[PDB]
Each structure stands twice: as structure tokens, then as C-alpha cells.
């Protein structure tokens, strides 16, 4: 009969004894009954499960990085993490402890890393989308006594891949749903548990199945993973992409894929880097390269449509100047430096979740009474930093050349020009003071200087957050000199080489360094 | 057939007229049917239930002290309470009153105390993490299943994360576990799969939680033991004695190539992490060890990797957080208060500026309303004592006063640091520099008194880490000085005060 597959399957002894026992339940009942179909289908499920077929794991780290670098450009910390993983299992057999997790905003490429890690580790790739699952039976299945019963998707994908030790990409943990009568977060805890891997105990397969050799890479957008599951994972947050590495994703990965996708032969469409930088700067904002992929795709479609309805040109050269004819009007814009030194204007720096941008801070004091107004949709910490910097300027006023009764005879207005954008934080502190000093002295602020740093009443410049986006933003906007708190200079080692080589960065301890560098005339 | 197995364990008589009842029913049925699989299963799920074979519980308390101290460093009050429970457990053979509960933030080792208690009492460990016979086949209940798997009559039982058990959804009510916890309803716990009453007495119960958000039928029976946050010397002693070897064995690092110094661990605790427990420290140490393994495979020239306080920027990235230090390099018109929080302690510098003006009073730095009330109270103390401090008393209308605390976008609230702000006001009004080596804490009243505060230990460890030499505490917190480590007492010159005159005598460098 079929004893050669039970014996040749080389199962563990419990699976072997109950499959052989269940065949010795099979061979004295009629094959047209329902029970022979139940135990026959159960034997076939037990035969197609990968009990011992195990794939070979790679051990090289140079070639594994060469595999990881031909699908993705700049996820250097994640690639280093996978090389640490492959470094560790060249000593031990099975890694114990937490599993991998990839948290990021949409479009950063944390689902298309599954094939990259499965190629770099030499392991077979299995993906399971968990975006709307409600019942535990997608993880654990149903009992053998039910009529249309079968294992869950876990055992069915192990049998679908036919090889133990695969790589799993649990696609969306943070999108799972709860329900009565069962919950796949508990069953998924039973999947991810290192002291429950060897005894999984599926409902259809009442044997224990070993899941300790399977690699677990799970993926999410937020930190809304449940606390039974989030404390068994290792969160690697993928941040946004800078403009230069978005340019490199576009040049090296997105442009040939979209030329192949819209079927563009050689020599009928070229796109230089000025057009792509105009897409990143003027037409997209998001963190990720999916919308950049869509704008490249519509450049390719408009190239095709402009080719087969003209039949005279056979080549279209898109650059930064004729991009308006294809994409349209520039939907967004970034801040730039002023071309001449103004008397009440300093360039602050700002950080958002999609990058940074230049702020403008414009003060104007007129002859008046004691009154002082703040406009520009400011938060309480921002305004509170303005009046803190104000009492910095009220002290040391004769040192700065300021008539010290000015607060009882000048009206001071502070305005950031954007109006409808909420702007909060202390990081525009030492810029703010500067503008006040400038409007109280007539000393014009030189327009090459960007400033960041919170201020205290004795004049110290305390650290900030999000420096790299502010330096890339200031380097984008033609700023030459930036001022920084001193103990942010550690973060200067994680800046690219052209930004360090093109900016004149001055570490600053006290407000007198700020007023010595950022003003045109001596104080 | 199976009769020597059912008499081989000597089950109680009720369960053997049940077991012999389905045995004589099994004599009158077909063997190969699935109903006989239910019958043989029901026989099998009673001969695994531990009707006997207890574990001999241990009665001495010195070997229990050291076998508690062999896996956990500094939970001394918890270990005291466990040895007291083993003392009454030594005299009273069956404690069925309340149940031990371990409340504390995540990161401290309240779950592995089930292991240390488990081999400390001598009994067997079954962990329960919370967060009827028929034709299709049924497993027994979870409470009974753990018992059968363990196969012992006296197994320690843990109810982990009852704060995460009772959710806002339809789940388990309080019934099926308080009927386990109560003393009179445990002589007959009829499991629904077996319909046979099984005893639950002489079974130790330990329940762990992260808060007191426990259901009201359960909080009546749970002794709330609190587990405070670990100090930095304790985290160093936990990393060096219990946490580096488990990462070395789960990474297979033999002892010759990797050396993680003490300044490296203190650099991780101070510069790279902020939590109450030692979990994030283990993510940093595990990352450090796997980077050592990667740096041994990718370079066969060097073999020994030395990691210290300097080369933790080559590894682990750059310094994520930072702590406050004493500004000892100069003595100026600001003070150094003390701030308490869940992660630990923090220095809290407080700045004032008093310029000529109309008497405007500006308070700045995301201050809570109780702090602003303490500034107004402290300024009233200064106005009531204006002549004898040497202040021209018209400063309420002739000088504008600004009180700033430097970490903006950090919400700060609390009645403490009132005498600190009074010291800063007397300082900036008199032109008398506050000496920088003095940290301060306390609560000011209009009569000039100093009222007690809370969290004195973390304020003293923050002040000891910051480089402060002299600490001014209230008088009624001398009591809390009975639980400070003596290196911190030996390094800090602690002055308990009771008025503002004792404060201004010490904290100002010139006499007033």
C-alpha cells in the first residue's frame, strides 16, 4: 500500500507511531465510508509535511552583503544586522530569543526585504499576510473530526515550501483583528515562543511540530503590536530616506524597473538627475520611494504617449527645465537663503517627519509702549522660548549696546512667515534672541547663517534633536554657515562627507559666540 | 489490561468507581470506534492527574536565602517576604490565606522569581500566563493541564500579568480563578472535562503584575509587594553577574576574545538607556556581543576585542540620552534642584533673572500650576523677609522677575523645589552667588518652614551621580536616610534643614 512513504518519510517516533496506528485503523474499514476519507486525508497531510528536509544556511558575509546590495540601496543598519545574524549562526545552530521586526512608514521597503534576506541567507522564502485575520484557525486549523477540516496556514505553508528551516515574513502584525471564540495573537504567541517551538501542537496535526529552526522576520508600520507579541520581538525602525539616497534608489533601482515595466527600448527616453531631484524636491514629500516610483512611471507613460502620437521624434530628453510640461505645476516648495543681509531676519532650522526645512524668523520693534506680540501659529514652548530669549536680551543690554529701558518704550513683534503651519519647540531659541538683538541694534544678520539651539537665561546653548535633517535642509537651501550647540557635535560623525565639506559648522557654547558670528557688525 | 495501571497509582476511591465505571463500560463496546477513543482518552486524562507523589518542601532558610541569591541580585525586601512565607509555610503546613503578588514595572525580574522561588521552596514550577467530554475530542482545562503535565501534587502556580489579563473585552471573568484562590472552594474543584472533584490545597500561588489594576474579587486576596526601580550600581551588578554570561552562552562566545568593561556598562546605563529595569541593557549588550562576533568573522587578524567606555561609539551607535551634571566650574545666581521620576532621578537646574522693570512675574519652562504656586509662595517668603535679607523692599514694583527651568518641552510639576526657587530669588535679588556644590529639595511655606518631599533616594542618587557634594533635605526626611547605601551617605554631605534660614546659611556663599 503506502507504507513506503510512511517509512521513507523518516518522521519522529510519535508521528510515526500514530500514523502507522492510524493506518492500522484504516485497513479494516470500508474505503467508501467517511472515516477512511478522514484518516486517509490525514495520512496524506502527515506525509506532505517537511519533517526533516532542511536547507543549507550560508556562511559568507562578503557575498551576502553583495546579495543585499543588489536589491536595496541604503538600509545599512538593517544589512549590518543581518550580517550580525549570519555571523552568529556560524557558531550556534538555532538562534534563541527575539525575532526580527521591521517598523517603518509606508514605501521604505520593509516587505521587499524578505526575498533579499532569503537570498542572502540561502533560505526558502514564505510570506504570510496578517492584515485582516480574525480567527485562530488560520494559525491552528481545526480538529480532524470536522468535515471540511485542514491545518492552518502555518502548516499549509510549511507543506507548500516542502522544507523546514524556511524564512517567514509575517507581513503585518499591527493589522491583526480580534474576535470571539479565538484570537490569532495568542496562537501567534504560540508560534513565536522559544519554549513552545518544539511543541506546536496544531489542531489537525495533533503531533508536535518543530518550529525552532524557522526564521521569523515580521513587519509593521507602527508600534501598535500587542504587548504579548511586542515583548518577543526586536524592533528595527526604518526611518525616511534622504534626497541623495532617494536619488540613488531612483537611478539604480526605480528607473530600470520602470523602463522594463512600461517597455521602453534603448534610446527613446533618458532622464537625468536634475529631473529626479526636481521630483524629490518640488513634487513629492513622503518618506519612501513609492510616490517617486509613481512619478517616474508617469514620466514613462507620457514619454510613450508623446512618442506614438508624434512619429517624428524618436527620443525624449527630460530634464529639470521641461519637467513642467510632463508633471505640471510644482506642488510643494522648500525654503532658500536670502541673497542679501536683512536687519531683523534670521534663518532657523526645523525638523519634520519627512525631513527638515529652513525657517524664517522676522522680528520688528517699533517705537511704542511696553507691548509684545507673537504671530505665526506658535506653540507654548516656542513662545515661552521667545520670552526667555527676551529676558536674555534685557540682561546684558548695555554690553550689547542696547538702551536698557527699551522694554518700556518699544513694541516688539515676532513673526514666522508661514502663518498656517503649527510650529513648536525650543530649538528656535538662539536664533530668536539673535533677531531680537538685531532689531534692537540695527545690526543686519548675515544671510549665510542658519541657527539652532535652545537658550537659557545665562546664555547657554543647550542641545537639540534631529540634527541630520537640519544640516541636509540647510545644505539644500544654499546656507554656508550653520551654528550648533557644542554637545551636538557627536552627531557630526553621522553626516555625509559633502555636507560636512560644504558647510562651515561652528560649535557654540554661549550666546556671545552666536552674536559674534551671525551678525555683520561687532557687538 | 488497564486495571493494573489504574490501581498502579492508587487513585482515590471516587475517581476509581468513575474510572472502573468507564472500564466496565469499555468492556461492553467496540475497540476501534472513536467513542472508544474518547473513553481511552478519558482514562488517560485521569491517570496523569497527580493524585499523589508530593514534592518534599524545604524547611531551612539559609540555603533558601543563598538559592534565592544565586539568580537575582537586589530584590532584598521581596526575598525577605518569601522567606517569611516559607517560615509560616514551615510551621503551618497549608497556608490558604492571601496570595503573593509582585507589582512592578517591566524589566525587573518578577517572572524569574517564579524560578528562584520554584527551586527555593523545593516544589515544581508551573507557569500560567494570563493575557467537557464529547465526540470531537476535548482537552482538559488549563488549570488542571499544567498540573497533569507537571505531575506533582504541590506545584507552584503563577498568574502572570493580571493587569494584562482583564481587558476591556469579553473574556475570562473573575469566577474561574477566584474559585481557585479561595480556601473553602478548593477541596472540591470539579473540572468540567473530568467531572471529578480534585483538590487544590497545598499548592503555592504567585501572581505577578505591573500595576494594581486587578479585578476587585482578586485584589482582596493579593498582597501587593512593590518592586522599585534598580539603581545604577545595582544595574551594573546585575549586568556583570547575571546578564553577560547568558548572552555569552546564547551567542557562544568563549571567554578569551570578548571583554566588556565596567565603564562600558556604566556608559550604557548612563548614556545609552533610560528605563527602570535591565531589559534595554540586554538589547544593548546582545547587540554588542553580536557585533563582536561579526568583527571576528570579518577580520581574522585581531582575535581579542576590548570594549570600554571610549569605543562605545564605534559600536551601538552614538549616545542617545544624557544626564545632568553639577555646574561646579562657577558659582552663579542659579540653583540646582532635584527632580524625581519613574526612570530614576534627575538634576533640575533653576534659573532666575531680576532686571529693572515694573514688577512683571514670568514663569517659564513648561511649569505645572503647583510649581508656579510654589514660586509665588517662595516670592512671598522673600517679600516678608525683605529687610533682614538686605533687599530693598520695593522690588515687587521696581524689578521684573523671570524664573526659567532649562529643559523646555518637558512638563514639570510638583510642590518640591520651593526652597530652591526661594534660594534663587534671594540670590538674584541680593547678588549673592549660590554655591554650585549644593543641590536642594524641599517645600516652602509662608512662615518659612520646609515641608517633606517624596522620592528622596532617587534624588540622592541623581545628586551623587551629578557631582553634588552637599544636599539640603527637609528635617522630616532624615527617616528616609535609613535606606541609602553608605557609599552615597559617605560621599554626600547631607544637611537636614527645617527653615529657610538654615537653607540660606548653607546654600549662599556669602553670609546674609
Amino acid at each position: 500500500a503506502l507504507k513506503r512513504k510512511i517509512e521513507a518519510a523518516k518522521m519522529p517516533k510519535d508521528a510515526r507511531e500514530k500514523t502507522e496506528a492510524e493506518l492500522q485503523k484504516l485497513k479494516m474499514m470500508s474505503p467508501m465510508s467517511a472515516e477512511a476519507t478522514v484518516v486517509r486525508g490525514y495520512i496524506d497531510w502527515m506525509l506532505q509535511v517537511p519533517w526533516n528536509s532542511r536547507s543549507k544556511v550560508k556562511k559568507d558575509l562578503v557575498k551576502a552583503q553583495e546579495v543585499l546590495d543588489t536589491d536595496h540601496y541604503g538600509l545599512e543598519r538593517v544589512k549590518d544586522r543581518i550580517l550580525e545574524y549570519l555571523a552568529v549562526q556560524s557558531r550556534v545552530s538555532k538562534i534563541k530569543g527575539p525575532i526580527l521586526c521591521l517598523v517603518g512608514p509606508p514605501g521604505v521597503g520593509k516587505t521587499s526585504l524578505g526575498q533579499s534576506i532569503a537570498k542572502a541567507t540561502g533560505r526558502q522564502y514564505v510570506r504570510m499576510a496578517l492584515g485582516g485575520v480574525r480567527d485562530e484557525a488560520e494559525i491552528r486549523g481545526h480538529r480532524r473530526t470536522y468535515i471540511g477540516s485542514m491545518p492552518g496556514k502555518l502548516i499549509q505553508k510549511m507543506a507548500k515550501v516542502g522544507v523546514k528551516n524556511p524564512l517567514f515574513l509575517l507581513d503585518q502584525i499591527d493589522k491583526m483583528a480580534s474576535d470571539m471564540r479565538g484570537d490569532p495573537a495568542s496562537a501567534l504567541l504560540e508560534v513565536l515562543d522559544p519554549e513552545q517551538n518544539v511543541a506546536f501542537n496544531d489542531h489537525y496535526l495533533e503531533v508536535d511540530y518543530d518550529l525552532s529552526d524557522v526564521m521569523f522576520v515580521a513587519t509593521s508600520n507602527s508600534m501598535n503590536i500587542p504587548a504579548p507579541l511586542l515583548d518577543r520581538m526586536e524592533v528595527i525602525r526604518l526611518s525616511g530616506y534622504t534626497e541623495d539616497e532617494k536619488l540613488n534608489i531612483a537611478k539604480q533601482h526605480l528607473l530600470p524597473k520602470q523602463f522594463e515595466r512600461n517597455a521602453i527600448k534603448k534610446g527613446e527616453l533618458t532622464i537625468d538627475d536634475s529631473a529626479i531631484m526636481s521630483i524629490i524636491r518640488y513634487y513629492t514629500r513622503e518618506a519612501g520611494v513609492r510616490s517617486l516610483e509613481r512619478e517616474i512611471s508617469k514620466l514613462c507613460r507620457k514619454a510613450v504617449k508623446n512618442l506614438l502620437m508624434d512619429k517624428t521624434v524618436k527620443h525624449i530628453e527630460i530634464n529639470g527645465d521641461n519637467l513642467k510640461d510632463f508633471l505640471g505645476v510644482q506642488k510643494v516648495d522648500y525654503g532658500r537663503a536670502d541673497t542679501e543681509n536683512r536687519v531683523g531676519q534670521v534663518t532657523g532650522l526645523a525638523w519634520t517627519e519627512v525631513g527638515g526645512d529652513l525657517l524664517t524668523i522676522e522680528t520688528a520693534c517699533v517705537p511704542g509702549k511696553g507691548k509684545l506680540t507673537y504671530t505665526g501659529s506658535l506653540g507654548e514652548v516656542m513662545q515661552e522660548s521667545i520670552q526667555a530669549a527676551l529676558t536674555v536680551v534685557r540682561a546684558r543690554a548695555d554690553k550689547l549696546g542696547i538702551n536698557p529701558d527699551f522694554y518700556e518704550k518699544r513694541d516688539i513683534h515676532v513673526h514666522v512667515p508661514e502663518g498656517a503651519t503649527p510650529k513648536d519647540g525650543p530649538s528656535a531659541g538662539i536664533a530668536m534672541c539673535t533677531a531680537l538683538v538685531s532689531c534692537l541694534t540695527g545690526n543686519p544678520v548675515r544671510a549665510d547663517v542658519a541657527m539652532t539651539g535652545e537658550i537659557t537665561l545665562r546664555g547657554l546653548v543647550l542641545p537639540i534633536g534631529g540634527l541630520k535633517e537640519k544640516l541636509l535642509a540647510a545644505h539644500r537651501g544654499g546656507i554656508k554657515v550653520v551654528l550648533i550647540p557644542d554637545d551636538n557635535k557627536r552627531d557630526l560623525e553621522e553626516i555625509p562627507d559633502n555636507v560636512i565639506a560644504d558647510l562651515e559648522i561652528h560649535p557654540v557654547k554661549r550666546i556671545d559666540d552666536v552674536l559674534a558670528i551671525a551678525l555683520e557688525h561687532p557687538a | 489490561a488497564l486495571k493494573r495501571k489504574i490501581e498502579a497509582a492508587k487513585m482515590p476511591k471516587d475517581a476509581r468507581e468513575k474510572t472502573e465505571a468507564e472500564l466496565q463500560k469499555l468492556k461492553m463496546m467496540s475497540p476501534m470506534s472513536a467513542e472508544a477513543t474518547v473513553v481511552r482518552g478519558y482514562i488517560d486524562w485521569m491517570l496523569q492527574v497527580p493524585w499523589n507523589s508530593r514534592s518534599k518542601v524545604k524547611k531551612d532558610l539559609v540555603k533558601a536565602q543563598e538559592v534565592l541569591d544565586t539568580d537575582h541580585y537586589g530584590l532584598e525586601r521581596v526575598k525577605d517576604r518569601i522567606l517569611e512565607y516559607l517560615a509560616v509555610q514551615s510551621r503551618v503546613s497549608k497556608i490558604k490565606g492571601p496570595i503573593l503578588c509582585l507589582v512592578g514595572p517591566p524589566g525587573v525580574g518578577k517572572t524569574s522569581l517564579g524560578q528562584s522561588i520554584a527551586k527555593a521552596t523545593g516544589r515544581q514550577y508551573v507557569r500560567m500566563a494570563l493575557g467537557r467530554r464529547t465526540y470531537i475530542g476535548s482537552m482538559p482545562g488549563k488549570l488542571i493541564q499544567k498540573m497533569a503535565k507537571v505531575g506533582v501534587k504541590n506545584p507552584l502556580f503563577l498568574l502572570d500579568q493580571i493587569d494584562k489579563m482583564a481587558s476591556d473585552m469579553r473574556g475570562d471573568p473573575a469566577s474561574a480563578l477566584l474559585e481557585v484562590l479561595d480556601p473553602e472552594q478548593n477541596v472540591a474543584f470539579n473540572d468540567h472535562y473530568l467531572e471529578v472533584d480534585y483538590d487544590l490545597s497545598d499548592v503555592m500561588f504567585v501572581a505577578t503584575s505591573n500595576s494594581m489594576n486587578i479585578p476587585a474579587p482578586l485584589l482582596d486576596r493579593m498582597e501587593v509587594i512593590r518592586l522599585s526601580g534598580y539603581t545604577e550600581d545595582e544595574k551594573l551588578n546585575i549586568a556583570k553577574q547575571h546578564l553577560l554570561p547568558k548572552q555569552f552562552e546564547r551567542n557562544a562566545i568563549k571567554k578569551g576574545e570578548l571583554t566588556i568593561d565596567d565603564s562600558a556598562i556604566m556608559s550604557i546605563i548612563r548614556y545609552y538607556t533610560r528605563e527602570a529595569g535591565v531589559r534595554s541593557l540586554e538589547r544593548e549588550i546582545s547587540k554588542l556581543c553580536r557585533k563582536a562576533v561579526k568583527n571576528l568573522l570579518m577580520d581574522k587578524t585581531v582575535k581579542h576585542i576590548e570594549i570600554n567606555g571610549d569605543n562605545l561609539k564605534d559600536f551601538l551607535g552614538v549616545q542617545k540620552v544624557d544626564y545632568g551634571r553639577a555646574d561646579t566650574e562657577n558659582r552663579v545666581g542659579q540653583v540646582t534642584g532635584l527632580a524625581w521620576t519613574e526612570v530614576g532621578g534627575d538634576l533640575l537646574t533653576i534659573e532666575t533673572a531680576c532686571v529693572p522693570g515694573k514688577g512683571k512675574l514670568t514663569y517659564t519652562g513648561s511649569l505645572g500650576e503647583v510649581m508656579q504656586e510654589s514660586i509665588q509662595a517662595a516670592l512671598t517668603v522673600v517679600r516678608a523677609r525683605a529687610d533682614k535679607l538686605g533687599i530693598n523692599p520695593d522690588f515687587y514694583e521696581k524689578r521684573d522677575i523671570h524664573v526659567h527651568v532649562p529643559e523646555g518641552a518637558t512638563p514639570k510639576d510638583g510642590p518640591s523645589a520651593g526652597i530652591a526657587m526661594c534660594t534663587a530669588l534671594v540670590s538674584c535679588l541680593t547678588g549673592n552667588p549660590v554655591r554650585a556644590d549644593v543641590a536642594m529639595t524641599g517645600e516652602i511655606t509662608l512662615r518659612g518652614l520646609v515641608l517633606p518631599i517624596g522620592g528622596l533616594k532617587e534624588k540622592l542618587l541623581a545628586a551623587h551621580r551629578g557631582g553634588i557634594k552637599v544636599v539640603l533635605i527637609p528635617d522630616d526626611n532624615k527617616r528616609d536616610l535609613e535606606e541609602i547605601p553608605d557609599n552615597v551617605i559617605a560621599d554626600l554631605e547631607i544637611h537636614p534643614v527645617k527653615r529657610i534660614d538654615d537653607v540660606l546659611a548653607i546654600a549662599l556663599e556669602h553670609p546674609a
Binding site: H142, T145, Y146, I147, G148, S149 | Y135, I136
Partner: peptide, 7 residues
């Protein structure tokens, strides 16, 4: 015996 999903 047959399973049946209820809402």
C-alpha cells in the same frame, strides 16, 4: 460534526 461560523 461540522463547524459553522456565527456572527
Amino acid at each position: 460534526a461540522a463547524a459553522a461560523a456565527a456572527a
